[PDB]
Design a binder for this molecule. Sequence first.
Ligand code: HEM
Ligand SMILES: C[C@]12CC[C@@H]3c4ccc(O)cc4CC[C@H]3[C@@H]1C[C@@H](O)[C@@H]2O
Ligand SMILES: C[C@]12CC[C@@H]3c4ccc(O)cc4CC[C@H]3[C@@H]1C[C@@H](O)[C@@H]2O
Length: 429
Amino acid sequence: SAVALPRVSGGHDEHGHLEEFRTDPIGLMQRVRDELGDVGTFQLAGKQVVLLSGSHANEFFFRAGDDDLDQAKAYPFMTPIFGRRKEMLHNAALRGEQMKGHAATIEDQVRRMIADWGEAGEIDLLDFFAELTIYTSSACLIGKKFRDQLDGRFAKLYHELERGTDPLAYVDPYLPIESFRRRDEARNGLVALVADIMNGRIANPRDMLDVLIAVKATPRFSADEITGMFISMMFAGHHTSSGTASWTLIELMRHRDAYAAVIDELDELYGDGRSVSFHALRQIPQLENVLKETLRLHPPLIILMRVAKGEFEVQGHRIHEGDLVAASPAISNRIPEDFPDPHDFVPARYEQPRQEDLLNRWTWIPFGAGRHRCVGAAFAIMQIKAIFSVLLREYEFEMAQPPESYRNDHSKMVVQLAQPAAVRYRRRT
Ligand code: HEM
Ligand SMILES: C[C@]12CC[C@@H]3c4ccc(O)cc4CC[C@H]3[C@@H]1C[C@@H](O)[C@@H]2O
Ligand SMILES: C[C@]12CC[C@@H]3c4ccc(O)cc4CC[C@H]3[C@@H]1C[C@@H](O)[C@@H]2O
């Protein structure tokens, strides 16, 4: 009875386009736009995904309220991981008055991570930034006391947790596969770590954990419940910040002229004698523009999803209740009409005379837009500023593998930098 929306080619595997989505999601999404335009679809197992692109369609997507396009059940792969949410789990730590302190905390975490680097050596970006961001996230979003009781084990387990987000979750988040088994085992390991910390606290007597432990119903929360809360407080900001930091360093190393400009700027700026806690909250133009361009080319979330709660018409095409509706920062961020030479790294794109990020309000979307725009955006930008203010003034970096060999692993809904990502460092002098 109802007219079928345009469908992208391919998708003849068991679960439609799901197999291709797991192997090359960006290529799939780009083909949707190339073949069909601003509104096109692909099949994700038993669900149809209406992929929107372009300013007009994206505006509809981002301005829609939860009453029209619901985000609530659009990300099933998160249910097994976690086991009003922002107000309860994110807002407190993100208040403006807390930022100065967070910048100092982040600076401290970076110095601790590079304390044993010495004069020269080599690191792997995924291993370094994944661990560093576990410490900045836990210290800032949960507590310094809590972070001090964490070590490499927590980071290793958290990573396996993130790897348990295969697209098969859209079939069922509890299917019997290896990645989901490891996901549950990883979560169980985190619960054990938290339980140990709790017993240590109780053993010999205040942060967030101290408060949660004292809540009663007989203790109201188990280690599993507390662990779920902590996992949720750090998740949205961990893989995003980890990856963005890695790609920021990669692009600087790939474009030494920009790297040189950032170095000169940092040296001049800190010449006033103020701390990172002062400068990370204020303008650092060249670095900020490198970050904006890095986010445009390497958005950590390549697809955003919603579930339609009613019927809507976008450019003559009708979206029906129950349809999965999506927008893609990966595709939108590179629309050639909006971003001249979209595949090139051009930080000048954001300088005062151009401001391509502000002019393309509905297509420059690494942080999303509208009602669900990233609430941690300011924190994330401040964190990159604080991290590189320390790293780039203390050390010099060079690629230890071909520039084109650095890449992301897109096999899971949670994008992660692929290994190896070898980089050499040497103290500046
Ligand atoms: C530069 C790194 C980051 C990027 C690129 C980024 C990007 C995004 C995007 C695109 C969304 C929208 C998802 C959707 O529309 O369904 C989002 C949501 C969110 N982000 Fe981030 N984010 C980053 C860092 C962070 C950090 C560090 C935190 C924690 C302080 C955080 C917390 C959140 C939360 C709580 C939401 C949900 C917002 C809502 O649904 O109302 N993000 N982020
Ligand atoms: C209010 C709360 C207990 C306190 C928790 C709580 C307590 C202190 C803190 O710093 C953070 C949180 C986050 C979650 C809070 C729970 C939400 C509800 O499920 C429950 O009633
Ligand atoms: C659901 C989420 C927004 C979408 C994120 C999201 C969106 C797309 C994607 O491919 C991966 C992720 C990973 C993290 C997700 C966030 C966890 C919550 O803190 C927040 O509400």
